[PDB]
């Protein structure tokens, strides 16, 4: 089914296949009505235009609410397998089989075009009811098939005789390809083919004289191979329109990003383009660009990325230079270059001002904090602080925003969570973001919906309620990840959770080998801290504490200056408490623990107070004053069982007191 691929502005052999089916359905002489599902799979890919930006937008509208079958490749083998599935589909498939055998010439092709335009197609419904004398079904221009057939008819009167000669040469080439297939052998004889074929071949006006040499003109042109064939220019094996090719690739990249498809067939045909279709169809370059990221190729990806932005910018009359730089900046952020992306992005702001268009700045401003969210350590380098943006976007407008406010409030929530603000304000801010996301469609905006789940699981896990976290955890999508943050980030993140499980299960050999991978991999900041935190916990288990104690405080010191992450400042703090008291010297931690107790009492996070409570009771039991620790734990025993992951530490202390 493979062959050279070429873009054609004329009647592809695929287009006539739909034309064959619509003729049978409208003729109503055979009583054969094509199922509505068959038409919706064939014509719909041909419908014009879907559009797809490289990045900055993921499946904003491309996602179909109802799952759709993949578009069908232009091979007679693939089209039949659609009709063939039905028990009576052999009747429908044979109808197409007979017609494709009936059309042995270009004049016959013209017969089909003339029949549809004069009788079948109808200008408007007002003449439909006055055409009750028609023995065939009639179609309106504005209908689904009507607008399709009008374009096909327009696409037929547009070319010269050179256009029609190429029509018939390829179809016979297209037809004879299916002849050398196993499926054709199963349909070698079907008696119904002769019946349907003879229905249209009648009224030939000659059967004695012209048909002897009518055969001669075709056979001589065809490759009988008795002698050397008549020499002709190389002809493409498959012809596809721009719109049909757009639907296959868009489905392929979406399917690759996250009824069976043919990845092998689509990729081979797309590799045989004549280098002029790629200019008329720039999206072929990016199809390599997504593939290039998969194997993590640096030089290959950049040439494809640059190539896609040279062809797209000129075709679109609007200025798109202000979009190319940030996307390249996005690509730079994907390979953890970070600093190189900053210089590239900076020049994007200057070009946007020259255009003097307001709508693009919001796209620029949204990209700002998305990059800072992945890499919070660069918040100082920007010319605008993160708090400035939130104040601008909150009062941005009252109309024509839709998703801007949904974006605006989530960034405030991350900063408030990092700033260890009061839990009353964090819940209210998160409420603002949850209400605006779910108000509109959450399915189309898959990216923010996943980010809601990630925050809410993180927010409630921080509160200490795993029961709530578990419900939302089943909705967080895996391996989906997000744009501008690598491509193997999902694999690494899944690996971190395995390592944490291995520490609990005392698989010290596994974690030790993984820590070797940590020091020479390029990791996102959120991934850095976890492995940075993982290294601290592993060293505590081993028993060596001089290195870990000198190591943990440098982390927290740079966890307060480089990034003002309070949550990770707290989480790092308690291991040092655990390191001290495990070494039979926890009194040094008494000044440190109390500063956090009254500090977190004002905040009101119950998980924070109780964890400090366990460390306080544990301090008091290693000094020789376990009497009052029992009294203190007894009054608060009711409120400390509400948190599941501390019960194991809580229950274990109970047998010690006994």
């Amino acid at each position: 089914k493979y062959g050279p691929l070429g873009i054609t502005n004329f009647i592809t052999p695929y287009d006539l296949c739909i034309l064959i089916l619509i003729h049978a359905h409208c003729s109503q002489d055979n009583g054969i009505s094509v199922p509505t599902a068959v038409f919706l799979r064939l014509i719909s890919p041909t419908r014009p235009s879907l559009e797809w930006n490289p990045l900055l937008k993921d499946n904003s509208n491309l996602r179909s609410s109802s799952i759709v079958p993949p578009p069908v490749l232009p091979i007679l083998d693939n089209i039949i397998r659609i009709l063939l599935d039905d028990k009576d589909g052999n009747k429908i498939a044979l109808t197409l089989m007979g017609y494709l055998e009936a059309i042995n010439g270009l004049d016959s092709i013209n017969r089909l075009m003339m029949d549809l335009e004069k009788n079948c197609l109808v200008n408007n419904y007002r003449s439909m009811k006055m055409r009750t004398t028609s023995t065939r079904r009639q179609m309106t221009r504005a209908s689904f098939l009507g607008t399709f057939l009008s374009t096909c008819i327009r696409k037929y009167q547009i070319g010269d005789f050179e256009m029609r000669e190429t029509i018939w040469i390829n179809l016979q080439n297209f037809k004879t390809v299916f002849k050398h297939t196993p499926l054709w052998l199963r349909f070698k004889d079907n008696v119904h083919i002769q019946k349907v074929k003879n229905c249209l071949l009648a009224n030939d006006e000659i059967s004695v004289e012209d048909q002897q040499m009518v055969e001669f003109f075709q056979h001589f042109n065809n490759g009988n191979d008795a002698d050397s064939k008549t020499m002709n220019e190389e002809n493409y094996g498959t012809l596809i329109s721009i719109q049909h090719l757009q639907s296959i690739v868009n489905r392929q990249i979406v399917n690759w990003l996250d009824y069976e498809e043919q990845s092998g067939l689509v990729f081979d045909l797309l590799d045989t383009l004549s280098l002029n279709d790629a200019t008329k169809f720039p999206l072929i370059f990016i199809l390599k660009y997504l593939e290039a990221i998969k194997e993590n190729s640096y030089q290959t990806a950049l040439d494809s990325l640059h190539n896609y932005f040279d062809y797209k910018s000129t075709g679109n009359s609007q200025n798109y230079f202000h979009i190319s730089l940030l996307s390249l900046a996005t690509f730079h952020s994907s390979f953890n270059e970070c600093d190189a992306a900053i210089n590239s992005f900076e020049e994007a702001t200057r070009i946007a001002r020259e255009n003097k268009d307001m709508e693009t700045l919001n796209l620029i401003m949204i990209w700002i904090i998305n990059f800072i969210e992945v890499h919070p350590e660069y918040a100082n380098r920007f010319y605008i602080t993160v708090e400035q943006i939130i104040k601008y976007l909150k009062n941005s407008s009252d109309v024509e925003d839709a998703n801007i406010f949904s974006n605006a409030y989530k960034f405030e929530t991350l900063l408030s969570m990092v700033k260890e603000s009061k839990t009353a304000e964090v819940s209210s801010s998160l409420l603002k973001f949850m209400a605006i996301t779910l108000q509109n469609v959450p399915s189309q905006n898959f990216d923010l919906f996943q980010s809601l789940v990630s925050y809410e699981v993180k927010f409630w896990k921080e509160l200490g309620y795993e029961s709530i976290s578990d419900v939302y955890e089943k909705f967080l999508s895996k391996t989906s990840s997000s744009s501008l943050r690598n491509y193997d980030s999902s694999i690494i993140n899944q690996d971190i959770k395995v390592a944490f499980k291995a520490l609990e299960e005392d698989d010290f050999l596994k974690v030790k080998q993984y820590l070797l991978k940590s020091e020479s991999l390029e990791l996102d900041y959120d991934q850095k801290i976890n492995l940075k935190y993982l290294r601290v916990k592993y060293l505590v288990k081993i028993g060596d504490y001089d290195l870990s104690m000198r190591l943990i405080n440098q982390y927290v010191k740079e966890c307060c200056e480089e990034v003002a992450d309070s949550n990770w400042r707290f989480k790092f703090e308690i291991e040092s408490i655990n390191v001290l008291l495990l070494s039979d010297v926890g009194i040094r931690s008494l000044p440190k623990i109390i500063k956090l107790i009254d500090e977190y009492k004002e905040i009101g996070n119950p998980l924070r107070c109780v964890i400090l409570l366990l460390k306080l009771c544990e301090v008091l039991i290693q000094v020789g004053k376990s009497m009052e620790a029992e009294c203190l734990i007894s009054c608060n025993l009711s409120t400390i069982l509400e948190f599941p992951f501390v019960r194991k530490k809580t229950d274990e202390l109970l047998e010690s007191l006994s």
């Binding site: 235009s49 559009e51 008329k280 925003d401 839709a402 406010f405």
Partner: protein, 96 residues
């Protein structure tokens, strides 16, 4: 693209609180006449991208009457000093 107003909730609250130049592309330039093609309407500009089929369809529609419109104006037969453009002009006045 709900514009914050297609949301029923925030739309309800607002009521209570109240109380493009074109540049040619490379494919646009043609071989025969150095004048580039200028699209007639914004419908032929697909998201800023010029549809090669649609533009070439208009080109065929333009050239088609041009063959029939050949004889108008300049062409003059021998033996008749008046061209057929005003043959139909006086013919129009004949019945009217």
């Amino acid at each position: 693209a709900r514009a914050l107003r297609d949301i029923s909730l925030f739309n309800d609250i607002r009521k209570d609180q109240n109380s493009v130049k074109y540049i040619p592309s490379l494919s646009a330039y043609n071989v025969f006449n150095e004048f580039p093609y200028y699209p007639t309407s914004a419908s032929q500009l697909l998201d800023g991208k010029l549809d090669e089929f649609l533009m070439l369809s208009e080109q065929y529609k333009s050239r088609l009457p041009k063959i029939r419109k050949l004889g108008w104006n300049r062409f003059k037969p021998i033996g008749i000093n008046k061209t057929m453009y005003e043959l139909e002009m006086l013919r129009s006045r004949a019945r009217a």
